Design a protein around this ligand. Structure first.
Ligand code: I3P
Length: 128
């Protein structure tokens, strides 16, 4: 009951480009009463040297069913990276002071992606 997340991945291998389209989420769970329903999505490539491994969607306002409809792009992504790394996608609510509450996540092993073949996801978030 944490919510479901919709997204699409495409590895444009010849251009060393991993395109992560964060589409929508449905039924995000209300948590902290002092929090806001201001959801956003964070991407992390693991393992990663921090900083550069992170991308982030826009933050929406007052919604438990956000539609970001946004593509985040990792450039300089090689086959060594696709074989070694995991993409962690986490959904958080931004609070009144710019901090946040973690709702849930999903992970995907990049070696399961075939070059140039888009893969569409509709998964339920989990806590780990
Ligand atoms: O530099 P950016 O573009 O802001 O990207 C931030 C980065 O991905 C952090 O890992 C994340 O921290 P948390 O996972 O702890 O939230 C932060 O969330 P934030 O919006 O709360 O700072 C993101 O905004």
């Amino acid at each position: 009951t944490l919510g479901a997340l919709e997204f699409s991945l495409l590895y444009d291998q010849d251009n060393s480009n991993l395109q992560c389209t964060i589409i929508r989420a449905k039924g995000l769970k209300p948590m902290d009463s002092n929090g806001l329903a201001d959801p956003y999505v964070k991407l992390h490539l693991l393992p990663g040297a921090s900083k550069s491994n992170k991308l982030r969607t826009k933050t929406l306002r007052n919604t438990r069913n956000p539609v970001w409809n946004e593509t985040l792009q990792y450039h300089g992504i090689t086959e060594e990276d696709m074989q070694r790394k995991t993409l962690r996608i986490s959904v958080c609510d931004e609070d009144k002071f710019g901090h946040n509450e973690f709702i849930g996540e999903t992970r995907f092993s990049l070696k399961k992606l075939k070059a140039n073949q888009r893969k569409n996801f509709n998964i339920c978030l989990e806590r780990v």
